From a paper:
The small protein [name] in [name] interacts with the transmembrane portion of the multidrug efflux pump [name] and increases resistance of the bacterium to a subset of the antibiotic substrates of that transporter. [name] is the energy-transducing component of a tripartite multidrug efflux machinery that includes the outer membrane protein TolC and the periplasmic bridging partner AcrA. To investigate how [name] affects [name], we determined cryo-EM structures of [name] and the [name] complex reconstituted in a disc in which a bilayer of E. coli lipids is encircled by the membrane scaffold protein saposin A (Frauenfeld et al., 2016). Trimeric [name] cycles through three states in the transport process, and [name] associates with the subunits in the loose (L) and tight (T) states, but not with the periplasmic region of the open state (O).
We developed a procedure to reconstitute purified E. coli [name] and the [name] complex into discs using E. coli lipids and saposin A as scaffolding protein (details in the STAR Methods). In the [name] structure in saposin A discs, we noted a previously unseen, significant bending of [name] toward the binding groove in [name], which was most pronounced in L and O states. Each of the three AcrZs in the saposin disc bends toward [name] between residues 10 and 15 (F10, A11, V12, I13, M14, and V15). The bending mode is also predicted by molecular dynamics simulations of the [name] complex in a lipid bilayer. Our best model for the [name] complex in saposin A discs is consistent with acyl chain packing observed in the structure of [name] in co-polymers. A structural comparison of [name] and [name] when both are in saposin A discs indicates small changes in all three [name] protomers in PC1/2 and PN2 and TMH 2 and 8. Channel 1, for entry from the periplasm, has an altered entry shape with closer access from above the membrane surface in [name] compared with [name]. Even though chloramphenicol or minocycline was added to other samples as well, density was not observed in this position for the maps for the [name] and [name] structures in the natural lipid composition or [name] with cardiolipin supplement. The structure, together with mutagenesis data, revealed that the overall bent shape of [name] is being recognized rather than specific interacting residues, which also may be the case for the transmembrane interactions of other small proteins with their cognate partners (Hobson et al., 2018).
Numbering used by the authors:
A (entry chain H): 1 to 37
B (entry chain B): 1 to 1033
C (entry chain D): 11 to 166
D (entry chain A): 101 to 250
E (entry chain C): 701 to 900
F (entry chain C): 51 to 150
G (entry chain A): 301 to 350
H (entry chain A): 651 to 700
């Protein structure tokens, strides 16, 4: 009854962070392939 | 189908309920175990010839059996060991899939027909047939705090008051006892025998004649006289129970009227059958019960029942006698399974959160949370059907199937919401349209993932027995997922969702979620523009594709292989070996040093030390021993330095600087059946009757020529014992006849005195027990004692052994071994870093081709499989690729479009090869399965992108570039949703230190990296491949 | 007792010339004995290591050493048919008539296993043919019983 | 596979009721057809060895590995394995007041493995340094050793 | 005690009886080895004489009408009846002296079980019974479960045969109706797309 | 030539311990008589392959003959499927009194 | 399959046979089976062509 | 072969080709077993056979 709250905390923390990380990777690859043209 | 359940949602809810109830009943009726039956079925014939050496035993017992081991079906091989303790072990190994009962029976039957050729001593001791391919579920120990009860007394108490209960427990399949119950030991004295002109033969005969049974009949029995009114069963002399009774036995009566009794000449006691093995628990004498689990059992409830019975019986024990649990791997299993269950639930919570984050609808999140558990429970029911269990491999297949389940749900819900938003349609018609789009895609996905996973079930041996679990688990999960996406999720999206119209829901709402919609729209537009700029010149990116293929091939070649990763099961094993000619004293000194070390310099981590003397796996002799080191719980020892690998290295460092010995510490292998990662097992055989000497010469020569190739081989060594000194007693028959001595009496005296003789049975309080006559330690300990033993001639005079028996020293093998009926020597070795098993295994053949004549070779263990069934992965994966291409051609109705998908296999693969390379892993089973999972996910995303593009091009004529851009725009959202959910549900498996950390990390790394790379690359290269294929054809 | 002598015993037993030289250059004992009384000479002869025998002899290895039961490197060299070992041992003072706790000599051993090339050397080096064992038998009776008439002629 | 088991479970009751001359030779319970799958002949191209010498090789080196192959069931040998064959002469036996029983007893006594025990065995004394298996009497390996039988 | 309690219930239980045999008298014959050795007689010859004379001794086989039959050596009936008939049986000593058993043999009586029963590794006693006419077997089993509850400690009870299976038939039933009802309810809601038609 | 108390400790109880741990065992009884005759009846669950049951019993039994008197082994120990009740009882009679 | 196993086994001692021994197969029923199957397969192919 | 073998004396030498199913014999053949059920003996049974 306390480990699940820890997991939910971990999730609410990382979900947006992991999302921003993936989106930044996508933005970088997009800028790269735009430079390639 | 979906248009049949949207109008009929109660039907779908009913099917879901039925599946849920099935899975619920299954999880109750499912056996739980650490690993399934992986190792091939084997059977061990164990025999014993007390007082014999290796050659006597190999001649009178082993060869005889092996010659009558004919006519047994499905036999892969057999290997025999014959030790100087009289012990024999003939291990037969059958083809996988064989029934371990019918084979045991064929063996027991051939042996039961062969027995009359063995000497009476073996028929009298007992030749047993057991199943070998099992392991101790548990090992219970019993000790006394006070030094009153010794090893044998504890063993007797165990055999009497504890074994029968542990056997009547539920799940307990086999119960072996370490130590032997009481036995009447008769230690004789040669001086006091010659005093009365006696011999051990007289003792033997008297004991045989004065302890036996007698049938004496009845009174008034049939046929009776006419008039009998009474019948009674007669009871004549029966067996003896006490020790005094054995003391009151008459051996002789002198001319002076005196009486000769045992208690005067032979010290009688109540000891054990064998002292060869001595067990200690933290220095305290102990006894043990090894417990192998039964078929279809629950290890957890079984261990609980055992602890409950032993607790019930504790209060009825003597004073100071108590119980302990050295080897209990049940907690490791409990934790490893609880962790996977927690991971499965976290993978649902994360799906909920992700959906609420992108789709602000709660009614949308509710759907996957209902669809995924249904599929997991249906998978449990499917397993229960096919006869599978809840094990490590199955649950790790489930935690990899969750990603496919999540995708199968999220694609549907996302597309339905997308339609409802764009076209302002309501839920029912929006679902109709989305399913019209996605039906064939889901079906082709199902077929593709089947083609990707099924080919693994059809490997050979233990490798295939492992892969079958993952394969069937994931295929069942995916099939139920597809059925669910076609049956239930549409009805749920129709009856639960709410209506929205003409709005991307990103400009009318404020807060974190409005801002997130804004940012996601910006990023989607940027990705669209980038892809649009890409599609104007493609070769610039096909070249990068080729570069990535080359890089991943390089990483694949430079990645080391493996079978399974070692773990921290809460226990490990120390092996003690001594030089040729050691004893119990020195081995126990070394073991006590080991214990003092562990209990002092590892007190912070180690709890107990169970030392068994005279029991090594390389040899069951007297100069060897082991220590089962038990650790505290993973909670009371955090940190790598306090784990089993660091403990092992430190112990080896502290034990290599030791004297006159060889001590090693090692970790309990994953599956007790030792399947190494890159090692082999090479048997060097005598095909010409050369002998032990020439065969040893060839072994030494081969090891020498192998030490000269360290670039491919290393740690090459024999897995046997080297010759030791042996005492030869040459008898002369001329003198034995002159003095009137019977060679039979000579050898009977020698044996019964120095090795031991089992005479007859007696009855203790209840149970029945043996009677062993023997010399006394101080009279059978050196050659100077030989002349202290006398025999009786025919004329009556007594004669000393020294009159007719010369003596010498020689060298002889303590442990002989054979492979398939012919002498052999076992050799071990590893492939040197950077090289594989095939290269070393071929080099050893090249070497053995240069050995003396008559010497040959063969392969055993993993080397057998690896050679017979170790080159069929390419064929089955070619089958897989072909079936996938054909299914994709059917789905897209084209022979070229499928390539657009089958070119994303590398994109994810490399992401798994990088991570596993960085974190320092190998190419093990879990990695091999995460690879296929990531490949399936990538192919899923690509298939939907391609089908969306093609549907737009065909039914709307949008064009190539426009349709492709629209497809990727519509497909971003669900791709990221699935990737994020899966990455999060897996990350704990990567950041893990404790139970199951090895398998957790191996499963999680290669899929985290895989999805990370397949998400941010496939979205770019798939449009490229599609436009390429469509412009070419 | 230093472990150097034990490693020397092991190396002689296993046939390691370089290691034996390395050890003796460090001053290792040669009169060292196993728990049964077998010095490196017994082990090198039993297993047939001529190089090791020569090495150990050059450095003062007692050729007349006897184990706990009267066995000598010559006894083993004769029993197992190591002609070169026999010759080498005798060149350096091997008592060809060495007598054990049972009265058995290299003659009886070489005759029990039919080794004529060795009985020739034993004799011509001064081996008493009439040497009786404990029970009263000699090489002549040991050749008559074993049925080796050739040997009986070699011993008349 | 079950018929064999029932048959042998029934025959394990009769086996004791048989003489020892039948048990020693070994009772077989095979599960096979009544027709030869195949024959495998072995010959000399150099005329060196003869029937007995080829049969011995076949039996001692080839029959046991093939009768363990799967599917065989039964194997018949078109020869016979070696055995120390001892041809008695009644006149020379009467010349020495002997009979076949004397020969049999002498062979059973002087050709025998014996369990002679260990030198340094357990339970040992406090302070023992040596352990060694004892060898007292081994089986015979040639005609020379059989001739010396007294 | 249980049978006595049951004999007070002729309206439920009848024909109650154990499936066993009561303890019986047994005749022990003690052989004194010392006196047989003093008189040159062997323990084995004495055992063989006693066995052959009082219980029979399978000697060997023979051929009757081409069939293999046995050969039994035994005493005449009038010499096996009473413990006073023994003593008429003599033996040959090393010299040949006719030695009677009365010199080295003593006798006594005891009580012992001619048949011992165990159930699941525990000592046990079987009891067979019928249900009284008009009644059933469940009522009788209930009554017997009651009676066996008043018995001393350490004395448990169990059912076998038609009483084991019967027990299952009484415990399977609830789990068989309930499920058979649910599967119906569901099966209806599916066919008639409603949770209410089932509930009616 | 055995008193039931003997047989219940040297044959019966020496086998019963081995038979615990079989796949689908339901219960088992055992009877030791004064003639030495021993009968140990193992009843399994319904649906079991009686042949495989006989087999598993033959397997768990050979673990015990090492511990049984030679007079038990030399007389034979049968492991055979069983039924408590007779199907038929054939009778044979002489009508002319020319036999007993 | 049994004859294949037997030939494979005999192919492991042929290297170790003393100088002079030679294997021969004077009675084998198995080749006839394989050949009678190959001939029917040839028939099937011929019929497809026809 | 059978014709050239009937000209051999003191022997019955017959060559034959094994049937398709060696476990099945001649087409339309019959195997018959005479049995003694009264304790007659081998002699009276031989007489009956003849």
């Amino acid at each position: 009854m306390l480990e699940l709250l820890k997991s939910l905390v971990f999730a609410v923390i990382m979900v947006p962070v992991v999302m921003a990380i993936i989106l930044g990777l996508i933005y970088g690859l997009g800028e790269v392939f735009n430079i390639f043209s | 189908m979906p248009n049949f359940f949207i109008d009929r949602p109660i039907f779908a809810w009913v099917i879901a309920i039925i599946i849920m109830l099935a899975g619920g009943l299954a999880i109750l009726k499912l056996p739980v175990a650490q690993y399934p039956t992986i190792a091939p079925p084997a059977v061990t014939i164990s025999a014993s010839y007390p007082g014999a050496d290796a050659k006597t035993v190999q001649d009178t017992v082993t060869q005889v059996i092996e010659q009558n081991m004919n006519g047994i079906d499905n036999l892969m091989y057999m290997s025999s060991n014959s030790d100087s303790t009289g012990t024999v072990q003939i291990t037969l190994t059958f083809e996988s899939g064989t029934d371990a009962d019918i084979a045991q029976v064929q063996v027991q039957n051939k042996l039961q027909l062969a027995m009359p050729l063995l000497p009476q001593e073996v028929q009298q001791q007992g030749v047993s047939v057991e199943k070998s391919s099992s392991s101790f579920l548990m090992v219970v120990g019993v000790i006394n705090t006070d030094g009153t009860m010794t090893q044998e007394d504890i063993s007797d108490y165990v055999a009497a008051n504890m074994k029968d209960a542990i056997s009547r427990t539920s799940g307990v399949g086999d119960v072996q006892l370490f130590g032997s119950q009481y036995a009447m030991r008769i230690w004789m004295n040669p001086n006091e025998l010659n005093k009365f002109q006696l011999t051990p033969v007289d003792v033997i005969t008297a004991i045989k004649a004065q302890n036996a049974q007698v049938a004496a009949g009845q009174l008034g029995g049939t046929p009776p006289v006419k008039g009998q009114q009474l019948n009674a069963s007669i009871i004549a002399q029966t067996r003896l129970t006490s020790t005094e009774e054995f003391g009151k036995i008459l051996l002789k009566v002198n001319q002076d009227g005196s009486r000769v009794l045992l208690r005067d000449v032979a010290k009688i006691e109540l000891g054990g059958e064998n002292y060869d093995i001595i067990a200690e628990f933290n220095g305290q004498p102990a006894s043990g019960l090894g417990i192998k689990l039964a078929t279809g059992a629950n290890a957890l409830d079984t261990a609980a029942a055992i602890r409950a019975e032993l607790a019930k019986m504790e209060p009825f024990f003597p004073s100071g006698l108590k119980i302990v649990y050295p080897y209990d791997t049940t907690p490791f299993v409990k934790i490893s399974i609880h962790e996977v269950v927690k991971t499965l639930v976290e993978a649902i919570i994360l799906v909920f959160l992700v959906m609420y984050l992108f789709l602000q609808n709660f009614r949308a999140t509710l759907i996957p949370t209902i669809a995924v558990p249904v599929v997991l429970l249906g998978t449990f029911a499917v397993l229960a059907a096919f006869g599978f269990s809840i094990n490590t491999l199955t649950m790790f297949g489930m935690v990899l199937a969750i990603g496919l389940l999540v995708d199968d749900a999220i694609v549907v819900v996302e597309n339905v919401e997308r339609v409802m938003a764009e076209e302002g349609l309501p839920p029912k018609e929006a679902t109709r349209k989305s399913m019209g789009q996605i039906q064939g895609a889901l079906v082709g996905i199902a077929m593709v993932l089947s083609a990707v996973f099924v080919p693994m079930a059809f490997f050979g041996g233990s490798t295939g027995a492992i892969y079958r679990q993952f394969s069937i688990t994931i295929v069942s999960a995916m099939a139920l997922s597809v059925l669910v996406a076609l049956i239930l999720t549409p009805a749920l999206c129709a009856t639960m969702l709410k209506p929205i119209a003409k709005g991307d829901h990103g400009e009318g709402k404020k807060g974190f979620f409005g801002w997130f919609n804004r940012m996601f729209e910006k990023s989607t537009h940027h990705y669209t523009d980038s892809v649009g700029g890409i599609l104007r010149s493609t070769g610039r990116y096909l070249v990068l594709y080729l570069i990535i293929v080359v890089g991943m091939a390089y990483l694949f070649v430079r990645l080391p292989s493996s079978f399974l990763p070692d773990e921290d099961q809460g226990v490990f094993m120390t092996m003690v070996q001594l030089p040729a000619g050691a004893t119990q004293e020195r081995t126990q000194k070394v073991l006590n040093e080991v214990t003092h070390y562990y209990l002092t310099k590892e007190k912070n981590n180690v709890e107990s030390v169970f030392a068994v003397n005279g029991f090594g796996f390389a040899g069951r002799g007297q100069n060897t021993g082991i220590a089962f080191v038990s650790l505290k719980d993973w909670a009371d020892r955090p940190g790598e330095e306090n784990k089993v690998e660091a403990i092992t290295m430190r112990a080896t460092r502290a034990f290599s600087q030791i004297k006159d010995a060889m001590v090693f510490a090692f970790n309990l292998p994953a599956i007790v059946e030792l399947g190494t990662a890159t090692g082999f097992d090479f048997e060097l055989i005598d095909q010409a009757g050369l002998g032990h000497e020439k065969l040893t010469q060839a072994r030494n020569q081969l090891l020498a020529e192998a030490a000269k190739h360290p670039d491919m081989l290393t740690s090459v060594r024999p897995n046997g014992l080297e010759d030791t000194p042996q005492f030869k007693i040459d008898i002369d028959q001329e003198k034995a006849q002159a003095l009137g001595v019977s060679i039979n009496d000579i050898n009977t005296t020698l044996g019964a005195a120095w090795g031991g003789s089992y005479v007859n049975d007696f009855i203790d309080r209840g149970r029945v027990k043996k009677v062993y006559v023997m010399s006394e330690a101080k009279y059978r300990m050196l050659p100077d004692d030989i002349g202290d033993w006398y025999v009786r001639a025919a004329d009556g005079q007594m004669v000393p052994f020294s009159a007719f028996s010369s003596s010498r020293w020689e060298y002889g093998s303590p442990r002989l071994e054979r492979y398939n009926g012919l002498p052999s020597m076992e050799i071990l070795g590893q492939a040197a870093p950077g090289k594989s098993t095939g290269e070393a295994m071929e080099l050893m053949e090249q070497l053995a081709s240069k050995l003396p004549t008559g010497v040959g070779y063969d392969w055993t263990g993993m080397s057998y499989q690896e050679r017979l069934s170790g080159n069929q992965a390419p064929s089955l994966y070619a089958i897989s690729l072909i079936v996938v291409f054909l299914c994709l051609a059917a789905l897209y109705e084209s022979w070229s479009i499928p390539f657009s998908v089958m070119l994303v296999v590398p994109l994810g693969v490399i992401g798994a090869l990088l991570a596993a390379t960085f974190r320092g892993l190998t190419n093990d089973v879990y990695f091999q399965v995460g690879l296929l999972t990531t490949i399936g996910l990538s192919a899923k995303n690509a298939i939907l992108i391609v089908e969306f593009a093609k549907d737009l091009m065909d039914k709307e004529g949008k064009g190539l570039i426009e349709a492709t851009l629209d497809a990727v725009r519509m497909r971003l959202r669900p791709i990221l949703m699935t990737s994020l959910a899966f990455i999060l549900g897996v990350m704990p498996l990567v950041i893990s230190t404790g139970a199951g950390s090895g398998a957790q990390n191996a499963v999680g790394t290669g899929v985290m990296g895989g999805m990370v790379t397949a998400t941010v690359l496939a979205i770019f290269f798939v449009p490229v491949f599609f436009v390429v294929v469509r412009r070419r054809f | 007792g230093s472990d150097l002598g034990k490693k020397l015993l092991e190396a002689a037993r296993a046939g390691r010339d370089d290691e034996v030289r390395i050890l003796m250059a460090n001053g290792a004992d040669v009169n060292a004995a196993d728990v049964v009384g077998w010095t490196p000479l017994h082990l090198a002869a039993y297993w047939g290591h001529l190089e090791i025998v020569e090495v150990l002899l050059k450095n003062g290895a007692d050729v007349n050493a006897y184990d706990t039961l009267g066995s000598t490197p010559l006894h083993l060299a004769a029993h197992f048919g190591h002609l070169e070992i026999v010759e080498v041992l005798l060149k350096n003072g091997a008592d060809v008539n060495a007598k054990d706790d049972n009265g058995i000599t290299p003659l009886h051993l070489a005759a029990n296993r039919g080794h004529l090339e060795i009985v020739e050397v034993l004799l011509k080096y001064g081996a008493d043919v009439n040497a009786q064992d404990k029970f009263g038998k000699t090489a002549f009776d040991i050749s008559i019983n074993n049925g080796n008439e050739d040997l009986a002629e070699i011993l008349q």
